């Protein structure tokens, strides 16, 4: 119901304040405190983002809603807390672990991601699926971004939501993540409503790249206008600002900015070359994905781009599609 809904979202708002106390002033929290200093988060960061630490006892947090007088089953049902099947008692989720709120659309906290800083198994423990926090739906910084993003035309996709909080204090506004998920029909729904153009900055590895290929076919059928940047070889967007400086980033988003038509040939460039039957298959997906392309004027250029990878001419080319 939305009572339960709210009591649920009341729920990570109150202990939300407890977990950024327990990061930024107990003894327990202060390694985890370093972690995040050794990372370039602020003081004025961490308390921006709601940043927190879970504390290792395992009834943190359990005592902590049970003293506020919340329902334990519900805080359960909330991803809070988890439960075990013998004893049927309840416990903390989330332990030892860097607490990134989790906000919707309308800006309220309804989930946790909870970072090891300890080199620990699941790197990232997200909250499960909960009334209030479902992955399809959710795109971190959402409710922050899309003021810039309606200003500037454009979302910007990143991998991480860790890429996201570096990229907006670097400067670049418009970006959002999904909670580790691949895009959904739901969240495509969500984006078109502020805008029809995308820009993908994933993660400058071959699995990026694959998720790149995969996510931008979708968008395109969904006739958005997909956009790609490619990071160098073996970085991340955070990795390249702590690398290069919020200036160089900032330079860089706007530079190699391609249509995913002209990134996807590049990526196939060399199979193309080689492999004949692959020749003809690729040019006829590629033929298929300029045709996708809403705006006439990016389809005439990327027809022009991608001609000569086939060693074909525009005109060719454009026969074909
Ligand atoms: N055990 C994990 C690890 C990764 N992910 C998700 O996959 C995304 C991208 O993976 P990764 O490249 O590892 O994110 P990073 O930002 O690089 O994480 P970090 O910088 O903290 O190492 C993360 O945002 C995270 O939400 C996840 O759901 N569960
Ligand atoms: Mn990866
Ligand atoms: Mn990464
Ligand atoms: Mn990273």
């Known amino acids: 119901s939305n009572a339960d809904d709210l009591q649920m979202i009341e729920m990570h708002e109150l202990i939300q304040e407890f977990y950024y106390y327990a990061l930024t002033k107990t003894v327990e929290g202060e390694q985890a405190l370093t972690y995040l200093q050794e990372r370039g ?32 089953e519900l805080a359960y049902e909330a991803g809070l807390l988890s439960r075990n099947e013998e004893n049927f008692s309840y416990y903390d989720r989330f332990r030892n672990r860097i607490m990134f709120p989790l906000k919707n659309a309308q800006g309220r906290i309804v989930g946790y991601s909870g970072r090891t800083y300890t080199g620990q198994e699941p790197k990232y423990l997200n909250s499960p699926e909960t009334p209030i926090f479902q992955k399809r739906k959710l795109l971190y910084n959402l409710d922050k971004a899309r003021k810039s993003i309606r200003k500037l035309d454009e979302i910007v996709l990143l991998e991480g939501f860790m890429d996201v909080i570096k990229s907006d204090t670097a400067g670049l506004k418009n970006v959002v993540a999904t909670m580790g998920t691949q895009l959904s029909d739901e969240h495509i729904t969500f984006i078109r409503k502020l805008t029809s153009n995308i820009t993908l900055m994933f993660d400058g590895d071959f699995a990026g790249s694959e998720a790149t290929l995969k996510t931008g076919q979708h968008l395109l059928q969904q006739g958005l206008n997909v956009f790609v940047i490619q990071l160098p070889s073996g970085m991340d967007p955070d990795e390249y ?81």
Request: aromatic share 12%; proline share 3%; charged share 25%.
């Open 41 to 72: 988060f602020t003081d004025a960061l961490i308390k921006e983002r709601g940043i927190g630490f879970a504390p290792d006892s395992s009834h943190f947090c359990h005592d902590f809603l049970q003293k506020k007088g919340y329902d334990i």
């Open 241 to 321: 600002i702590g690398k290069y400086g919020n200036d160089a980033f900032t330079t860089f988003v706007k530079n190699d900015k391609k249509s995913f038509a002209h990134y996807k040939v590049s990526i196939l460039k060399d199979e193309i070359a080689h492999n004949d039957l692959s020749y003809e298959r690729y040019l006829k997906e590629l033929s298929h994905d300029i045709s996708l392309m809403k705006s006439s004027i990016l389809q005439q250029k990327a027809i022009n781009d991608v001609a000569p990878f086939f060693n074909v001419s525009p005109e060719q080319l454009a026969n074909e599609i």
